[PDB]
Amino acid sequence: FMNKILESIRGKLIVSCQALEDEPLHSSFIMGRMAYAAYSGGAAGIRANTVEDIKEIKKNVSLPIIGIIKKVYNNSDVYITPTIKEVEDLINEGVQIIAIDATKRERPDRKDLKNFIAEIKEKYPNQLFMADISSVDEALYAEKIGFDIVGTTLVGYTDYTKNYKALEELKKVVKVVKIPVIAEGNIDTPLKAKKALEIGAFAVVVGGAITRPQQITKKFVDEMK
Amino acid sequence: FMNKILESIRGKLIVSCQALEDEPLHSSFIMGRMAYAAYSGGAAGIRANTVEDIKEIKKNVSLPIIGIIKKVYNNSDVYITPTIKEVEDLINEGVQIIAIDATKRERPDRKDLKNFIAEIKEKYPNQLFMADISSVDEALYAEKIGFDIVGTTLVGYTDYTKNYKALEELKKVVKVVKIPVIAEGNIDTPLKAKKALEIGAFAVVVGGAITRPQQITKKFVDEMK
Ligand SMILES: [Cl-]
Ligand SMILES: [Cl-]
Ligand SMILES: [Cl-]
Ligand SMILES: [Cl-]
């Protein structure tokens, strides 16, 4: 039953449909239509942020959703579903996969990651949980403390992985981790997405290169000077 | 004054923000936000279809707009601002540039293109008019009958130009036309947009590669099989 969720994304594309408050297309309505567009193009899952976006996305597609809640506390640089409070809001709405910052950095509620995951696995025993990590060490650790999925989402986004390449850290993760590794973070060309599967990713997440038109526009503009 | 409009786009990127009725993001609201995103990414103009989209786009950006009205009559394959009726609706709303199918094909109102343009140039003598053409012959003809701009928009979209390449027909148009030639139609990579300027285009229009996420998604999906 949690197996059926992972077979439905095996070897397929997941499109991240996010637009925070600063961003041009910030609107639950638009993110719902972006999800529909990814579906019409052949995507097999959606990654989505906040409950209002997730709800609207559910009206447009019946694709599986990786759900997160980004909230920035002033204690911590851990902000992807960082505390127990975000987990419950997502459990209440219902998503196929809840993704959580699984780096070694200190959390806003100053709770160990080993306990935190033990508490939600005890509390929500049928819920698929995904680990957003930045290094191979953290990906193996996430595996042993009980995560169902890892993702290379935070590669290059921590001090201790500054300038790490997505694909380069992926082939290190994939060769030592046994649970599904989802390639995610700066997979911004179709060719990189092919290489990610050829490296051994279980699925590939693409965000801005599909759903942030201002960042696609800036690529065109900067090569026209 | 019409000169200031063309200097503001010289050597720059125009982003076409369109989504017809069949399409995932069909909504004037979304097309307004897409225009804002192109602006945030560094675009210098917007191409837009229908008055409700143009109006919403005007709320988001003060970039110059190439305005069209696509309407398909059962008489003709000419559908980009095809009759005098669409021209007036756009004149009433007010756009910096009105773009019109300027191919040699028979129009829905069975009026010659030479007269049609003479009537609107007489009627709207300060309005900048752009010629959407498919071949070099039609681009030179558009120039002599009084158009202000030509665009390679319909290259490959007429029986007599089946399989013509955008860039290949562009360098033929640019070497014999004196008025500004805008490269438009299947300019779907940043590199093609650089080559279009290097060929001699006055400006470059990019559409789906920025503003149709389902067609960007399909490029990723098809290279993941
Ligand atoms: Cl994310
Ligand atoms: Cl991130
Ligand atoms: Cl068009
Ligand atoms: Cl077209």
PDB file of all heavy atoms in Angstrom, chain B residues 16 18 47 49 68 70 79-80 132 153-154 184, ligand 3:
ATOM      1  N   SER B  16       6.269  35.499 -24.834  1.00  0.00           N
ATOM      2  CA  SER B  16       4.876  35.316 -25.219  1.00  0.00           C
ATOM      3  C   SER B  16       4.151  34.569 -24.110  1.00  0.00           C
ATOM      4  O   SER B  16       4.506  33.427 -23.775  1.00  0.00           O
ATOM      5  CB  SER B  16       4.785  34.560 -26.543  1.00  0.00           C
ATOM      6  OG  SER B  16       3.448  34.195 -26.840  1.00  0.00           O
ATOM      7  N   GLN B  18       0.830  33.124 -23.461  1.00  0.00           N
ATOM      8  CA  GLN B  18      -0.429  32.687 -24.036  1.00  0.00           C
ATOM      9  C   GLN B  18      -0.801  31.319 -23.499  1.00  0.00           C
ATOM     10  O   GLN B  18       0.066  30.476 -23.233  1.00  0.00           O
ATOM     11  CB  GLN B  18      -0.370  32.613 -25.560  1.00  0.00           C
ATOM     12  CG  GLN B  18      -0.056  33.938 -26.224  1.00  0.00           C
ATOM     13  CD  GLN B  18       0.034  33.774 -27.720  1.00  0.00           C
ATOM     14  OE1 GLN B  18      -0.870  33.220 -28.347  1.00  0.00           O
ATOM     15  NE2 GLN B  18       1.141  34.219 -28.300  1.00  0.00           N
ATOM     16  N   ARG B  47       4.377  39.417 -25.489  1.00  0.00           N
ATOM     17  CA  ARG B  47       3.389  39.149 -26.529  1.00  0.00           C
ATOM     18  C   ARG B  47       2.196  38.448 -25.882  1.00  0.00           C
ATOM     19  O   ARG B  47       2.376  37.544 -25.062  1.00  0.00           O
ATOM     20  CB  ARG B  47       3.978  38.284 -27.656  1.00  0.00           C
ATOM     21  CG  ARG B  47       3.001  38.014 -28.806  1.00  0.00           C
ATOM     22  CD  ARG B  47       3.724  37.485 -30.036  1.00  0.00           C
ATOM     23  NE  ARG B  47       2.821  36.861 -31.018  1.00  0.00           N
ATOM     24  CZ  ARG B  47       2.796  37.174 -32.318  1.00  0.00           C
ATOM     25  NH1 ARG B  47       3.623  38.101 -32.800  1.00  0.00           N
ATOM     26  NH2 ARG B  47       1.958  36.557 -33.146  1.00  0.00           N
ATOM     27  N   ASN B  49      -2.336  37.430 -26.075  1.00  0.00           N
ATOM     28  CA  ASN B  49      -3.494  37.130 -26.905  1.00  0.00           C
ATOM     29  C   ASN B  49      -4.783  37.374 -26.122  1.00  0.00           C
ATOM     30  O   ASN B  49      -4.877  37.027 -24.944  1.00  0.00           O
ATOM     31  CB  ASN B  49      -3.397  35.688 -27.416  1.00  0.00           C
ATOM     32  CG  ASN B  49      -4.674  35.193 -28.059  1.00  0.00           C
ATOM     33  OD1 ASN B  49      -5.214  35.824 -28.988  1.00  0.00           O
ATOM     34  ND2 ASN B  49      -5.125  34.006 -27.624  1.00  0.00           N
ATOM     35  N   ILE B  68      -2.255  40.477 -29.936  1.00  0.00           N
ATOM     36  CA  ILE B  68      -2.937  39.759 -31.006  1.00  0.00           C
ATOM     37  C   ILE B  68      -4.309  39.348 -30.493  1.00  0.00           C
ATOM     38  O   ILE B  68      -4.597  39.414 -29.298  1.00  0.00           O
ATOM     39  CB  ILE B  68      -2.156  38.513 -31.494  1.00  0.00           C
ATOM     40  CG1 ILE B  68      -2.217  37.410 -30.437  1.00  0.00           C
ATOM     41  CG2 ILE B  68      -0.719  38.850 -31.836  1.00  0.00           C
ATOM     42  CD1 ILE B  68      -1.268  36.261 -30.704  1.00  0.00           C
ATOM     43  N   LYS B  70      -6.239  35.800 -31.534  1.00  0.00           N
ATOM     44  CA  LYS B  70      -6.404  34.614 -32.353  1.00  0.00           C
ATOM     45  C   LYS B  70      -7.888  34.276 -32.406  1.00  0.00           C
ATOM     46  O   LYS B  70      -8.522  34.078 -31.365  1.00  0.00           O
ATOM     47  CB  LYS B  70      -5.574  33.454 -31.802  1.00  0.00           C
ATOM     48  CG  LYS B  70      -4.063  33.593 -32.072  1.00  0.00           C
ATOM     49  CD  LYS B  70      -3.250  32.593 -31.235  1.00  0.00           C
ATOM     50  CE  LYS B  70      -1.782  32.614 -31.623  1.00  0.00           C
ATOM     51  NZ  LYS B  70      -0.901  31.976 -30.600  1.00  0.00           N
ATOM     52  N   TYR B  79      -5.665  33.205 -38.832  1.00  0.00           N
ATOM     53  CA  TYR B  79      -6.382  33.334 -37.565  1.00  0.00           C
ATOM     54  C   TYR B  79      -5.707  34.280 -36.575  1.00  0.00           C
ATOM     55  O   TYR B  79      -6.335  34.626 -35.567  1.00  0.00           O
ATOM     56  CB  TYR B  79      -6.589  31.947 -36.903  1.00  0.00           C
ATOM     57  CG  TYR B  79      -5.297  31.281 -36.481  1.00  0.00           C
ATOM     58  CD1 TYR B  79      -4.864  31.334 -35.158  1.00  0.00           C
ATOM     59  CD2 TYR B  79      -4.491  30.619 -37.411  1.00  0.00           C
ATOM     60  CE1 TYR B  79      -3.658  30.739 -34.765  1.00  0.00           C
ATOM     61  CE2 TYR B  79      -3.280  30.026 -37.031  1.00  0.00           C
ATOM     62  CZ  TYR B  79      -2.868  30.089 -35.703  1.00  0.00           C
ATOM     63  OH  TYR B  79      -1.675  29.506 -35.306  1.00  0.00           O
ATOM     64  N   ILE B  80      -4.483  34.733 -36.832  1.00  0.00           N
ATOM     65  CA  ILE B  80      -3.807  35.704 -35.975  1.00  0.00           C
ATOM     66  C   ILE B  80      -4.249  37.104 -36.397  1.00  0.00           C
ATOM     67  O   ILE B  80      -3.855  37.590 -37.463  1.00  0.00           O
ATOM     68  CB  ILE B  80      -2.283  35.554 -36.046  1.00  0.00           C
ATOM     69  CG1 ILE B  80      -1.849  34.235 -35.405  1.00  0.00           C
ATOM     70  CG2 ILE B  80      -1.591  36.748 -35.371  1.00  0.00           C
ATOM     71  CD1 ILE B  80      -0.376  33.921 -35.595  1.00  0.00           C
ATOM     72  N   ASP B 132       3.267  38.982 -39.027  1.00  0.00           N
ATOM     73  CA  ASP B 132       3.601  37.577 -38.800  1.00  0.00           C
ATOM     74  C   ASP B 132       3.624  36.879 -40.157  1.00  0.00           C
ATOM     75  O   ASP B 132       2.580  36.735 -40.804  1.00  0.00           O
ATOM     76  CB  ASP B 132       2.594  36.940 -37.841  1.00  0.00           C
ATOM     77  CG  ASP B 132       2.747  37.438 -36.377  1.00  0.00           C
ATOM     78  OD1 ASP B 132       3.873  37.792 -35.955  1.00  0.00           O
ATOM     79  OD2 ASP B 132       1.734  37.471 -35.642  1.00  0.00           O
ATOM     80  N   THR B 153       7.070  34.384 -37.209  1.00  0.00           N
ATOM     81  CA  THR B 153       6.171  33.639 -36.322  1.00  0.00           C
ATOM     82  C   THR B 153       5.562  32.414 -37.002  1.00  0.00           C
ATOM     83  O   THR B 153       5.351  31.373 -36.359  1.00  0.00           O
ATOM     84  CB  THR B 153       5.052  34.567 -35.840  1.00  0.00           C
ATOM     85  OG1 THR B 153       5.613  35.789 -35.335  1.00  0.00           O
ATOM     86  CG2 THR B 153       4.215  33.886 -34.765  1.00  0.00           C
ATOM     87  N   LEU B 154       5.239  32.522 -38.292  1.00  0.00           N
ATOM     88  CA  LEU B 154       4.519  31.450 -38.962  1.00  0.00           C
ATOM     89  C   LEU B 154       5.428  30.579 -39.820  1.00  0.00           C
ATOM     90  O   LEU B 154       4.930  29.793 -40.632  1.00  0.00           O
ATOM     91  CB  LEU B 154       3.371  32.034 -39.788  1.00  0.00           C
ATOM     92  CG  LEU B 154       2.310  32.743 -38.940  1.00  0.00           C
ATOM     93  CD1 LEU B 154       1.243  33.378 -39.812  1.00  0.00           C
ATOM     94  CD2 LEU B 154       1.690  31.794 -37.918  1.00  0.00           C
ATOM     95  N   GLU B 184      10.868  34.789 -33.976  1.00  0.00           N
ATOM     96  CA  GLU B 184       9.764  34.297 -33.176  1.00  0.00           C
ATOM     97  C   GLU B 184       9.289  32.994 -33.778  1.00  0.00           C
ATOM     98  O   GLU B 184       9.193  32.876 -35.002  1.00  0.00           O
ATOM     99  CB  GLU B 184       8.613  35.306 -33.133  1.00  0.00           C
ATOM    100  CG  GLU B 184       7.351  34.754 -32.484  1.00  0.00           C
ATOM    101  CD  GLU B 184       6.299  35.817 -32.312  1.00  0.00           C
ATOM    102  OE1 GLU B 184       6.643  37.016 -32.434  1.00  0.00           O
ATOM    103  OE2 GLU B 184       5.130  35.461 -32.069  1.00  0.00           O
TER     104      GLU B 184
HETATM  105 CL    CL C   3       1.393  33.801 -31.575  1.00  0.00          CL
END
